[PDB]
Structures are given as structure tokens and as C-alpha cells.
Design an enzyme around this catalytic site. Structure first.
Site, PDB file in Angstrom:
ATOM      1  N   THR A  95       0.856  -1.189   0.000  1.00  0.00           N
ATOM      2  CA  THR A  95       0.000   0.000   0.000  1.00  0.00           C
ATOM      3  C   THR A  95       0.876   1.217   0.000  1.00  0.00           C
ATOM      4  OG1 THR A  95      -0.047  -0.348   2.331  1.00  0.00           O
ATOM      5  CG2 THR A  95      -1.973  -1.003   1.062  1.00  0.00           C
ATOM      6  N   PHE A 135      -7.151   5.168   5.497  1.00  0.00           N
ATOM      7  CA  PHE A 135      -6.571   4.290   6.555  1.00  0.00           C
ATOM      8  C   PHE A 135      -7.667   3.578   7.346  1.00  0.00           C
ATOM      9  CE2 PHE A 135      -3.153   7.345   5.685  1.00  0.00           C
ATOM     10  CZ  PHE A 135      -2.154   6.449   5.349  1.00  0.00           C
ATOM     11  N   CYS A 188      -6.011   1.572  10.000  1.00  0.00           N
ATOM     12  CA  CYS A 188      -4.586   1.208   9.843  1.00  0.00           C
ATOM     13  C   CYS A 188      -3.724   1.458  11.066  1.00  0.00           C
ATOM     14  CB  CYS A 188      -3.914   1.951   8.659  1.00  0.00           C
ATOM     15  SG  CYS A 188      -2.332   1.326   8.229  1.00  0.00           S
TER      16      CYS A 188
END
Ligand code: HEM
Length: 442
Positions: free
Chosen positions: A254, A379, A386
Site C-alpha cells: 500500500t 486508513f 490502519c
């Protein structure tokens, strides 16, 4: 009142499935979303989800009192090798909350200060490779970004050198990864070497633990010595192998896409590039960057954020109704029902961003505080957001800033954007030429 939910055309028992016969399912879904709007149901043989694209409904889905994180099919297929590591556990699995607690303090300023010098190590290796290209040659951008981010997470997390820059092909670990990511993805679309790939990710797993085996302040340390301050428990044996894999995966793909997208938008938008380069040169006065300097690269951070707006590289996340409920006041939902948040579509909500959502404008992020809540979600959301957010951004700002300090970039093939999807997103085939500005390193 209560509305019937939009749904694209169904085709007997195939459902909406023939509408997704493509290697690029997210981009296809974005197209259905433009047609049908903020919410549409999508059905395939055996399965149903609802896709959400508006900030107004995604704020609601993001209420963790009503909706928790769901493992989509894809994350169920990744579950056979990632297991019940952070990314592929259910919130209600013992191991989720426990690794969360055991691994959290490994991520912020401070943990992130002690990650820095190793980030700079891989970064200088990147600059050096490009400094050393002859005139005839170009850079394969995603390939070099994955060499960097894979090595950065191996060093900072686990003290292990993948030594990806000594390789002109992708690392053995990468080539497994992409295939299985490819698979799980091709898999979804079937109305009916995945031993070679997983079988192969491990072995490497089993190589980083011996190393450590045959003191470091790192992810791996906490995975060995940390205990969850709630229950007292440590991470057990199979869970640990699961977290290693989880972070090597989550922690590089990512980030390399984000850096690839960011360079792509900067070479397509020369006025932005100029200003991003003027800042890198002004802020990065020393031979190699400090932690404090990377924090000062304000517009570089805006650039990155704007690339995440357009093409958020982990572009969808899944949720489920904790209980029977009503969404947006119109859409009743039964306990168990699935929601997928189409993030790129979210980041195109005209009600939030205005009428030029396709333009690359980093100045949009000038005052983050005036962006509504749940308008910008690359995120993810809530306690399942995240964990490596501040790691990803620090590493990308650092690397971008040094790219822009050390070279001028040329879009020499007039690259036409082509987004490959393996779950995650990258601009496939993005190539550039980098002309050195002849500035000495540390
Ligand atoms: C720009 C870079 C990145 C993006 C765009 C991104 C995106 C995301 C997203 C959207 C989720 C939520 C997934 C879901 O709800 O199913 C997630 C979760 C997660 N991410 Fe990232 N990620 C990035 C960098 C990283 C890095 C560098 C790491 C590791 C160092 C990482 C580790 C994780 C982990 C372990 C989870 C599961 C968290 C949990 O549920 O406790 N990410 N990430």
C-alpha cells in the site's frame, strides 16, 4: 419513508455477477456507483453486499456501536496464510484486541524516531541506485518502491535485510505475494500454486525467527516479549508467525502504491512538482534527512494525501450490522448484513470536495481540520483503522522528499495510467527517467 435499494441489473441466477468480469473489480464498481449513486446492493451467487460512496452514509457505517469490521471473501482467502493476525482477525477474536494492545505503542512519534535512521538507510540505497543508472536507462517505479518498502518494514520491524536492491527481479517473497493476492481476487468472480505461494511466504517467515533466534527495540521484540495489559496474556506461537506475515504484507504494498501514485501525479502536474521540489530543497539542508526535517515537509505530506484521495491503495473495507438496524433512515438491514465502503468513490463525493474531484490539488489539504469527519478514509475506520498509518506516511514523506531533492523527473513515455488491482492498487508499468541534480549524500 423506507426506500427500495438501488441495484444494478441481475441476470437470472448469475445475479449482478456478469457486470464484474474484469481484472479491475474496484474500478468497475466505481462505474456502477457513478450510475446508481451513494448506495447500491450487489449480489453474486451465494453472496450479497451493499456498496457505499457518500460521506453521508459512510459516516453512519463508521459508527462502531452499530457496525463492526467484516472479513470480505478476499480477507477470508488471505486468512489461510495471515491467519488471526491484526488485519485478518474478527474484532471479537481474543487475538485481535490482544495483538492491538501488545503492538500499539510500536507506532507513533518515539517508536517512529527509533525507526527513522533505518528508513534513511533503505532510502539512501534507493537514491544511489538511481544516481547510478546510465543515460540510456529509466526507472520502473512500482518495482523500486516495493523494493524500498519491503526492505524498510523488514529492517525496522524485524531487523532482517531482504537486500532487494541487489536484485534486478522482484524478491522471492514479492512474487508469491502478488500471485496469491491476484488469486483471492480472481477467486471472488468464479460461480463454480495457492500452495506454492503460501508454502513460500512462510519459509521466509521461518527465516526471520531463526535469525532473531540464532537486543532490538522493534515490532518483533514486542511480538516475543510483550504481554496484553488487560488479560496478561502474550502472543502465542501460531499467532506470532501470523503477525510477521501480516506486517510484511500490509506494511509494504500500500505504501509502494502510494509512492508510485504520488510520483505519477507529480510528473503529470509540473506546477505541483515544482513547488514540491522547491520545498524538499529548502527543508532538506543536510546530506541525509533528520526526523524533524521530515515533519517539516508540509506540502510533500499534502501531495501524499492528495494521491491517497484519488487512489487510496487499499481501496475498500468491509463492515457488518451488529444488530438489526436502519441505515440513512431509509435502508433497513438485518443483523449480519454486509457493507463495503468504496473509498475512491467516497473521496470523489462532490458534496464534500466540490466539482473538480479528478484534479490533483494538494492545496486541498492545507487545513485538514475543515475536511469533514469520515470524508477522507484511506486508513480505514475506528479501532480497526490502519495501525501503520504514521509509519507509512513518515516513510513516504521521507522518500518522496529525497527523490525531489536529488533528481528531476521526466515522464518519457507519456505514461498512460493503468491501475492493476490485487486487492491493493498500483499504477502498472509506470516508468520515468530521473536526471540527477548532483547533490552529495551522507
Ligand atoms: C499508505 C499506506 C497504507 C494504506 C493506504 C493502508 C490502509 C489500511 C486500511 C484501509 C486498513 C483497514 C482494512 C480493513 O478495515 O479491512 C488497514 C489496516 C491495517 N494496516 Fe494499513 N495501510 C498502509 C500502510 C500500512 C503499514 C506500513 C502497515 C504496517 C507497518 C499497515 C498495517 C496494517 C495492519 C496491521 C492493519 C489491521 C489493523 C487492525 O485491524 O488492527 N498499514 N490499513
Amino acid at each position: 419513508t423506507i426506500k427500495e435499494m438501488p441495484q444494478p441489473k441481475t441476470f437470472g441466477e448469475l445475479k449482478n455477477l456478469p457486470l464484474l468480469n474484469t481484472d479491475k473489480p474496484v474500478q468497475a464498481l466505481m462505474k456502477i456507483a457513478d450510475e446508481l449513486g451513494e448506495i447500491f446492493k450487489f449480489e453474486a451467487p451465494g453472496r450479497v453486499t451493499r456498496y457505499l460512496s457518500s460521506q453521508r452514509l459512510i459516516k453512519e457505517a463508521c459508527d462502531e456501536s452499530r457496525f463492526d469490521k467484516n472479513l470480505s471473501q478476499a480477507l477470508k482467502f488471505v486468512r489461510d496464510f495471515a491467519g488471526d493476525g491484526l488485519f485478518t482477525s474478527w474484532t471479537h477474536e481474543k487475538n485481535w484486541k490482544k495483538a492491538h494492545n501488545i503492538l500499539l505503542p510500536s507506532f507513533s512519534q518515539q517508536a517512529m524516531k527509533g525507526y527513522h535512521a533505518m528508513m534513511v538507510d533503505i532510502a539512501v540505497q534507493l537514491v544511489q541506485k538511481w544516481e547510478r543508472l546510465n543515460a540510456d536507462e529509466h526507472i520502473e517505479v512500482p518495482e523500486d518502491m516495493t523494493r524500498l518498502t519491503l526492505d524498510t518494514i523488514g529492517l525496522c520491524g524485524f531487523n532482517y535485510r531482504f537486500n532487494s536492491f541487489y536484485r534486478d527481479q522482484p524478491h522471492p517473497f514479492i512474487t508469491s505475494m502478488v500471485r496469491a493476492l491476484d488469486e483471492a481476487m480472481n477467486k471472488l468472480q468464479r460461480a463454480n500454486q495457492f500452495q506454492e505461494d503460501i508454502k513460500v511466504m512462510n519459509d521466509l517467515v521461518d527465516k526471520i525467527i531463526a535469525d532473531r533466534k540464532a537486543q532490538s527495540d522493534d515490532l518483533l521484540t514486542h511480538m516475543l516479549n510483550g504481554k496484553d495489559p488487560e488479560t496478561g496474556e502474550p502472543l502465542d506461537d501460531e499467532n506470532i508467525r501470523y503477525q510477521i506475515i501480516t506486517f510484511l504484507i500490509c506494511g509494504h504494498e500500500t505504501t509502494s502504491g502510494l509512492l508510485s501514485f504520488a510520483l505519477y501525479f507529480l510528473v503529470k502536474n509540473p506546477h505541483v512538482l515544482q513547488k514540491a521540489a522547491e520545498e524538499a530543497a529548502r527543508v532538506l539542508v543536510d546530506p541525509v534527512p533528520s526526523y524533524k526535517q521530515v515533519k517539516q515537509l508540509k506540502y510533500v505530506g499534502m501531495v501524499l494525501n492528495e494521491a491517497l484521495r484519488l487512489w487510496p491503495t487499499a481501496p475498500a473495507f468491509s463492515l457488518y450490522a451488529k444488530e438489526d438496524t436502519v441505515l440513512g433512515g431509509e435502508y433497513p438491514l438485518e443483523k449480519g448484513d454486509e457493507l463495503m465502503v468504496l473509498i475512491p468513490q467516497l473521496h470523489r463525493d462532490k458534496t464534500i470536495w466540490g466539482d473538480d474531484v479528478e484534479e490533483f490539488r494538494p492545496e486541498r489539504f492545507e487545513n485538514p481540520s475543515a475536511i469533514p469527519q469520515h470524508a477522507f478514509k484511506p486508513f480505514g475506520n475506528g479501532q480497526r483503522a490502519c495501525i501503520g498509518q504514521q509509519f507509512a506516511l513518515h516513510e513516504a514523506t521521507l522518500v518522496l522528499g529525497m527523490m525531489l531533492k536529488h533528481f528531476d523527473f521526466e515522464d518519457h513515455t507519456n505514461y498512460e495510467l493503468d491501475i492493476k488491482e490485487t486487492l491493493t492498487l498500483k499504477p502498472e508499468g509506470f516508468v520515468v527517467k530521473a536526471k540527477s541534480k548532483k547533490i552529495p549524500l551522507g
